[PDB]
Amino acid sequence: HWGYGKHNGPEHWHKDFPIAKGERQSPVDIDTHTAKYDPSLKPLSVSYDQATSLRILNNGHAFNVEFDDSQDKAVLKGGPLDGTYRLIQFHFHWGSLDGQGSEHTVDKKKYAAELHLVHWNTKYGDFGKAVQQPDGLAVLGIFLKVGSAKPGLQKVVDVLDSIKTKGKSADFTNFDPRGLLPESLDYWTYPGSLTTPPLLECVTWIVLKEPISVSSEQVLKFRKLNFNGEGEPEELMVDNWRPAQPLKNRQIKASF
Numbered sequence: 335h336w337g338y339g340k341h342n343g344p345e346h347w348h349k350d351f352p353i354a355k356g357e358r359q360s361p362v363d364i365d366t367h368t369a370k371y372d373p374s375l376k377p378l379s380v381s382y383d384q385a386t387s388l389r390i391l392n393n394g395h396a397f398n399v400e401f402d403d404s405q406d407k408a409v410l411k412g413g414p415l416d417g418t419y420r421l422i423q424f425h426f427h428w429g430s431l432d433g434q435g436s437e438h439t440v441d442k443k444k445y446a447a448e449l450h451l452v453h454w455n456t457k458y459g460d461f462g463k464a465v466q467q468p469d470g471l472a473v474l475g476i477f478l479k480v481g482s483a484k485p486g487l488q489k490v491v492d493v494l495d496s497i498k499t500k501g502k503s504a505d506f507t508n509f510d511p512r513g514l515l516p517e518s519l520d521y522w523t524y525p526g527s528l529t530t531p532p533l534l535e536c537v538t539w540i541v542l543k544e545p546i547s548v549s550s551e552q553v554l555k556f557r558k559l560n561f562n563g564e565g566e567p568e569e570l571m572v573d574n575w576r577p578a579q580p581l582k583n584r585q586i587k588a589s590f
């Protein structure tokens with residue numbers, strides 16, 4: 335089944351998910367010089383002060399931190415959105431080396447990792463209905479560069495030991511997502527897809543201009559995770575990112 339390896343990685347995905355060859359696939363290259371500055375873009379409203387994290391899980395592709403999304407606790411509004419989009423989970427894509435790992439690139443430059451805070455449009459009642467819709471999800475993507483440590487990421491890094499293999503989970507309450515955000519909320523937005531199967535074209539992508547930096551020690555621990563379940567041969571979870579897709583008749587708008 336799908337993965338990121340030679341025999342089941344992104345170049346084979348079209349065989350089970352034909353939408354891989356679609357018209358608004360993600361990620362894309364953000365070419366900063368032809369992104370259209372649009373002055374009617376409102377600022378982002380990120381309200382993560384009441385967020386409830388419940389769990390972290392290694393799902394054999396990445397590890398996810400899930401949040402309680404049954405009431406409007408952590409929401410995203412503003413920006414290019416019309417509607418309140420509720421936080422359900424966040425995860426990352428990262429590389430085996432520091433010069434690769436982001437899915438989106440800025441002027442063909444790749445970062446060491448990328449954070450995806452996944453939200454779904456509440457108009458649609460549950461997550462599973464929102465993925466049937468062209469404006470069902472909004473994913474806020476944040477690039478991570480290697481540098482000094484991000485204090486807020488360390489709590490996540492300490493637990494990775496209990497979720498080393500496919501299928502392990504640990505309770506992970508009281509995590510505040512606000513410590514993973516950059517100072518600036520300037521962005522680029524465009525319509526796209528999930529970057530993993532089923533590759534659905536539901537997503538408004540809001541990629542932030544400003545990256546966060548994390549130490550090389552923090553991102554090192556990401557790399558010690560496993561794609562396999564326990565008892566199966568060890569296969570390190572690295573380079574779990576999809577390469578950039580053709581923009582083909584889409585315009586990237588800039589809020590700045």
Ligand SMILES: CCN[C@H]1CN(CCOC)S(=O)(=O)c2sc(S(N)(=O)=O)cc21
Nearest residue numbers: 395450452465473527528529530531532
């Ligand atoms: C391993 C599978 N990951 C996906 C699980 N999703 C549910 C998909 O089936 C309805 S999802 O909405 O949470 C997302 S968002 C996302 S990315 N990288 O584009 O932000 C990938 C996935």
Ligand SMILES: [Hg+2]
Nearest residue numbers: 466467535536
């Ligand atoms: Hg969709």
Ligand SMILES: [Zn+2]
Nearest residue numbers: 425427450529
């Ligand atoms: Zn992702």
